[PDB]
Amino acid sequence: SKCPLMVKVLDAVRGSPAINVAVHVFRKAADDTWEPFASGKTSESGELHGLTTEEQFVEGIYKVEIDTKSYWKALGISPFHEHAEVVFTANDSGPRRYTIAALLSPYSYSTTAVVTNPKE
Amino acid sequence: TGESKCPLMVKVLDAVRGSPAINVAVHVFRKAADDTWEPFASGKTSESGELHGLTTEEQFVEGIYKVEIDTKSYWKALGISPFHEHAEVVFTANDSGPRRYTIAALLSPYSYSTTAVVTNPKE
Amino acid sequence: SKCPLMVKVLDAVRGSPAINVAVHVFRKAADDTWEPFASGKTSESGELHGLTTEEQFVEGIYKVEIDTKSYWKALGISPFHEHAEVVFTANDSGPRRYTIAALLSPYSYSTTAVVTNPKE
Amino acid sequence: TGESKCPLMVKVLDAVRGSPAINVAVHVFRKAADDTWEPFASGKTSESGELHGLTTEEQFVEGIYKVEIDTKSYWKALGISPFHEHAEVVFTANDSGPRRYTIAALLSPYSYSTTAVVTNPKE
Ligand SMILES: Cc1[nH]c(=O)c(C#N)cc1-c1ccncc1
Ligand SMILES: Cc1[nH]c(=O)c(C#N)cc1-c1ccncc1
């Protein structure tokens, strides 16, 4: 029960988890370029688990990109955004469990992080 | 009015159409001497999603006020059956003298957010 | 694993669950008055479970009130809101699992409902 | 300017202090012919949390634009170490002719929301 990184996606129009949403994760590279890190599709409960492991999850800059436009086109709704992106630094600073959650509407989105830890 | 020095203004936006939320009914109450809510002001949002002229500086004394927005009538007229009955904002006002209050609401059928911007009147 | 109603509370300032937040639930009465239904305090994970049961959870109007002001005063932050309230109708219409989530900041809050169901 | 017919306006608010987010750096890019982001316009929010005058109707052609807000420099100057590096909004503009775009952001240290209000210019 150790997932250093988890993504959750919700739909504000229908009051349900946003199922089958593509998610891509990149790590900032030395040349200051984005390199593919992990990717997947949200499950029936709007979640994506097992993107990585504590050993591979070192300090650095990460970018989480959510394909919100494909989600909305499948419902027959025209969206405003091309995609939703979250960029943050992961620091061993202290606590290492990260939950990124995204709430989606056709013209707006909100994102929040919940950073927590078992013990230390 | 002036430019924007109203003691109380409400602004409602639509997260589904990316537009101002027009013709939304808004009701404001003040808590009375007896723990009961009394009618204070009423109105509807204009074509830019705003509601101006609800009160005056002199009438807007210190107190606990309730801003109730009728979101359910708004989604229903669009053919959508939403989650909430209404949106309500409860807050203590003019506590440490007069201030100008902007209450904003962003609406979606199963979600809403609300924010306040408080400014100190011509200092 | 059957909780018709669950409440989740998060803190936007500190990126953590909002722990020990008082929550009260009322049911609209015939005289159109609010009657105490259930109450509790959020756990270490920001959640409140077991407010009720499927038999007691009949159709009607419910009001969930979150004591946000006490939460913020304990951190030494002066808040704008007296409390956060969610009013909704529970209809057997179809699906009966309700998750109310609230995200808190000193001057703003957002609430969303996730309505779902196992089978039917 | 006029009253409010700017093709692109940005508005940043602070959810912790209930105020406009003043002196926030904003950078806008357009995707070029070669899948690369090119600099388009730059600026800072004023005392009301707004940014006016970034472009003109004639210069704002159809394309994919990126609005990047520097939220991290804003929280840091307040003594707070926030979660995000910045906030970014990516969207296709003027696709089916000219429109006026208002991008709003509401900020908190570990959260942000963004909304767009799109209007059809003097019809
Ligand atoms: C971006 C934004 N997000 C919210 O969650 C919210 C709420 N409530 C309001 C606004 C906002 C939009 C336009 N002008 C001012 C504030
Ligand atoms: C991202 C998010 N945004 C909101 O505006 C909100 C409200 N209210 C809740 C959540 C949320 C975060 C984590 N788990 C579930 C929901």
Distance separating alpha carbons of residues A82 and A76, to the nearest angstrom: 15
Kindly tell me the number of DSSP H helices and DSSP E strands found in chain D.
Answer: 1, 9
Kindly tell me the number of DSSP H helices and DSSP E strands found in chain A.
Answer: 1, 9
The CB of D104 under 6 Å from ligand 1? The reply is: yes
Experimental determination approach used:
X-ray
β-strand partners of D25: D44
Give the ligand whose atoms come closest to the C-alpha of residue B19.
Answer: 1
The CB of A8 under 6 Å from ligand 2? The reply is: yes
Residue C25 token pair: 């639930």
Q: List the residue whose alpha carbon is closest to atom 3 of ligand 2.
A: A103
Q: How far does the centroid of ligand 1 lie from the alpha carbon of residue C32, in Å?
A: 33
- Are D62 and D91 within 8 A, CB to CB? no
Closest Cβ opposite residue D18 in set C13, C103, C107: C107
What domains appear along chain A, each with residue ranges and CATH number? 1-120 (2.60.40.180)
Between chains, do A107 and B18 touch, taking CB under 8 Å as contact?
A: yes
Residue (of C66, C67, C68, C58) closest to C28 by Cα position: C58
Residue spans of beta strands (DSSP E) within D1-123: 8-14, 19-20, 25-31, 37-44, 50-51, 63-69, 87-93, 100-108, 111-119
The CB of D111 under 6 Å from ligand 1? The reply is: no
Resolution for the entry shown, Å: 1.9
Distance separating alpha carbons of residues A54 and A97, to the nearest angstrom: 10
Contacts of B89 (CB under 8 A, 6+ apart): B66, B67, B69, B103, B105, B114, B116, C81
D neighbours by CB contacts (3+ pairs under 8 Å)? A, B, C
Distance separating alpha carbons of residues D108 and C46, to the nearest angstrom: 19
Q: How far does the centroid of ligand 2 lie from the alpha carbon of residue A111, in Å?
A: 8
Q: How far does the centroid of ligand 2 lie from the alpha carbon of residue B28, in Å?
A: 28
Judge whether D11 is annotated as a binding position: yes
The CB of B48 under 6 Å from ligand 1? The reply is: no
Residue (of D91, D89, D94) closest to D51 by Cα position: D89
- Are B74 and B24 within 8 A, CB to CB? yes
Residue (of A99, A82, A101) closest to D112 by Cα position: A101
Give the ligand whose atoms come closest to the C-alpha of residue B13.
Answer: 1
Q: How far is CA A90 from CA A55, A96, A99, D10, in A?
A: 13, 8, 12, 29
Q: Which helix (H) or strand (E) holds B63?
A: strand B63-69
Alpha helices in chain A (DSSP H): 68-75
Distance separating alpha carbons of residues A4 and A105, to the nearest angstrom: 27
Q: How near does any CA of chain D get to the CA of A83, in Å? A: 7
Residues of chain B whose beta carbon is less than 8 angstroms from a beta carbon of chain D are: 13, 15, 18-20, 106, 113, 115-119
Contacts of B108 (CB under 8 A, 6+ apart): A12, A13, A105, A108, B15, B16, C112
Residue (of A39, A37, A40) closest to A60 by Cα position: A37
Closest Cβ opposite residue D115 in set A61, A89, A107: A107
3-state secondary structure B42-58: EEECCCCCEECCCCCCC
The CB of D106 under 6 Å from ligand 1? The reply is: yes
∠ CA C107-A12-C4 to the nearest 5 degrees? 95
Judged by DSSP in three states, A42 sits in coil
- Residue C48 Ramachandran class (φ > 0 left, ψ -120 to 50 alpha, else beta): beta
- Are A98 and A89 within 8 A, CB to CB? no
Contacts of C113 (CB under 8 A, 6+ apart): A15, B83, B84, B110, B111, C86, C88, C98, C99, C100, C101
Residue C9 token pair: 């509370």
Q: List the residue whose alpha carbon is closest to atom 5 of ligand 2.
A: C110
Counting ligand 1 atoms within 8 A of each CB, the residue from D115, D117, D119 with the most, and so the one to mutate, is D115
Between chains, do A12 and B83 touch, taking CB under 8 Å as contact?
A: no
Rounded to 5 degrees, what are φ and ψ at D73? -60, -40
Helix, strand and coil content of chain A, in percent to the nearest 5, comes to 5, 50, 45
Distance separating alpha carbons of residues A31 and B14, to the nearest angstrom: 41
Judge whether D50 is annotated as a binding position: yes
- Are A67 and A102 within 8 A, CB to CB? no
Q: How far does the centroid of ligand 1 lie from the alpha carbon of residue D13, in Å?
A: 8
Q: Which helix (H) or strand (E) holds B75?
A: helix B71-76
Strand order from edge to edge, sheet including A34-41: A34-41, A22-28, A60-66, A84-90
Contacts of A1 (CB under 8 A, 6+ apart): none
Q: How far does the centroid of ligand 2 lie from the alpha carbon of residue D4, in Å?
A: 33
Chain C residue nearest residue B86, CA to CA: C87
Residue (of B3, B7, B13) closest to D115 by Cα position: B13
Question: For residues B56-71, b (16+ Cβ closer than 10 Å) or e, as one string?
Answer: eeeebeebbbbbbbbb
Q: How near does any CA of chain C get to the CA of B38, in Å? A: 16
First to last CA, chain A: 16
Judge whether A47 is annotated as a binding position: yes
Read off the DSSP letter of residue D97. Answer: B
